[PDB]
Amino acid sequence: APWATAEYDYDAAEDNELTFVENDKIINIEFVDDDWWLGELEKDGSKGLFPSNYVSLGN
Amino acid sequence: AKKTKPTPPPKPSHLKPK
Protein backbone atom coordinates (compact mmCIF):
# COMPACT_ATOMS: atom_id res chain seq x y z
CA ALA A 1 0.00 0.00 0.00
CA PRO A 2 0.98 3.70 -0.39
CA TRP A 3 3.12 5.47 2.18
CA ALA A 4 3.34 8.88 3.76
CA THR A 5 5.40 11.09 6.04
CA ALA A 6 4.26 13.03 9.10
CA GLU A 7 4.37 16.82 8.99
CA TYR A 8 3.02 17.51 12.51
CA ASP A 9 3.30 15.79 15.91
CA TYR A 10 -0.07 14.09 15.75
CA ASP A 11 -1.55 12.82 19.00
CA ALA A 12 -4.59 10.74 17.81
CA ALA A 13 -7.57 12.91 18.85
CA GLU A 14 -10.16 10.00 18.91
CA ASP A 15 -8.29 6.85 20.17
CA ASN A 16 -8.43 4.74 17.03
CA GLU A 17 -6.45 7.24 15.09
CA LEU A 18 -2.76 6.76 14.40
CA THR A 19 -0.19 8.82 16.17
CA PHE A 20 3.05 10.16 14.84
CA VAL A 21 5.71 12.79 15.22
CA GLU A 22 6.95 14.98 12.37
CA ASN A 23 9.17 13.41 9.82
CA ASP A 24 7.56 10.11 10.91
CA LYS A 25 7.35 7.65 8.12
CA ILE A 26 4.03 5.90 7.45
CA ILE A 27 3.50 2.87 5.21
CA ASN A 28 0.92 0.37 4.07
CA ILE A 29 -1.42 3.25 3.70
CA GLU A 30 -4.95 2.53 2.65
CA PHE A 31 -8.07 4.36 1.66
CA VAL A 32 -10.33 3.15 4.42
CA ASP A 33 -11.88 6.63 4.40
CA ASP A 34 -11.67 9.61 2.04
CA ASP A 35 -10.44 11.84 4.85
CA TRP A 36 -8.75 9.39 7.23
CA TRP A 37 -6.54 6.76 5.62
CA LEU A 38 -5.09 3.84 7.47
CA GLY A 39 -1.47 3.22 8.08
CA GLU A 40 1.44 1.19 9.26
CA LEU A 41 4.55 2.96 10.53
CA GLU A 42 7.67 1.79 8.75
CA LYS A 43 9.70 2.82 11.81
CA ASP A 44 7.61 0.94 14.44
CA GLY A 45 4.87 -0.80 12.47
CA SER A 46 1.95 1.09 14.04
CA LYS A 47 -1.39 1.11 12.20
CA GLY A 48 -4.36 3.43 12.55
CA LEU A 49 -6.59 5.95 10.84
CA PHE A 50 -4.97 9.38 10.48
CA PRO A 51 -6.13 12.72 9.17
CA SER A 52 -4.42 12.66 5.86
CA ASN A 53 -3.88 16.45 6.27
CA TYR A 54 -1.56 15.80 9.25
CA VAL A 55 0.66 13.82 6.84
CA SER A 56 2.06 14.03 3.32
CA LEU A 57 1.76 11.04 0.98
CA GLY A 58 5.06 9.87 -0.37
CA ASN A 59 3.30 8.48 -3.44
CA ALA B 1 0.65 21.59 22.82
CA LYS B 2 2.90 21.51 19.69
CA LYS B 3 2.04 24.91 18.18
CA THR B 4 1.83 24.30 14.37
CA LYS B 5 -0.22 21.17 13.65
CA PRO B 6 -3.49 21.14 11.66
CA THR B 7 -6.64 20.32 13.61
CA PRO B 8 -7.47 16.60 13.10
CA PRO B 9 -10.59 17.08 10.94
CA PRO B 10 -13.86 15.18 11.50
CA LYS B 11 -13.77 11.39 11.55
CA PRO B 12 -16.21 9.11 9.74
CA SER B 13 -18.19 7.80 12.71
CA HIS B 14 -17.87 4.22 11.46
CA LEU B 15 -14.16 4.23 12.40
CA LYS B 16 -14.27 4.56 16.19
CA PRO B 17 -13.36 1.97 18.88
CA LYS B 18 -16.04 -0.53 19.93
Q: What is the DSSP string of A11-54?
A: E-SSSSB-EE-TT-EEEEEE-SSSSEEEEE-TTT----EEEGGG
Burial tier of B13 (Cβ tally within 10 Å: 0-12, 13-18, 19+):
exposed
CA–CA min distance B17, chain A (Å)? 6
| Method in brief | NMR
Does residue A37 sit at the B interface (CB-CB below 8 Å)? no
Residues 6+ apart with CB under 8 A from A21: A6, A9, A10
Burial tier of B5 (Cβ tally within 10 Å: 0-12, 13-18, 19+):
middle
- CB-CB under 8 Å, B12 with A8: no
Residues spanned by the domain of A12: 1-59
CATH number at A33 reads 2.30.30.40
Structural domain tally of chain A?
A: 1
- CB-CB under 8 Å, B5 with A54: yes
Dihedral angle, C-alpha A31, A42, A44, A36, nearest 10 °:
-20
* Closest B-chain CA to A12: B8
Residues 6+ apart with CB under 8 A from A13: B8, B11
Q: Whole-angstrom Cα distance, residue B18 to residue B13?
A: 11
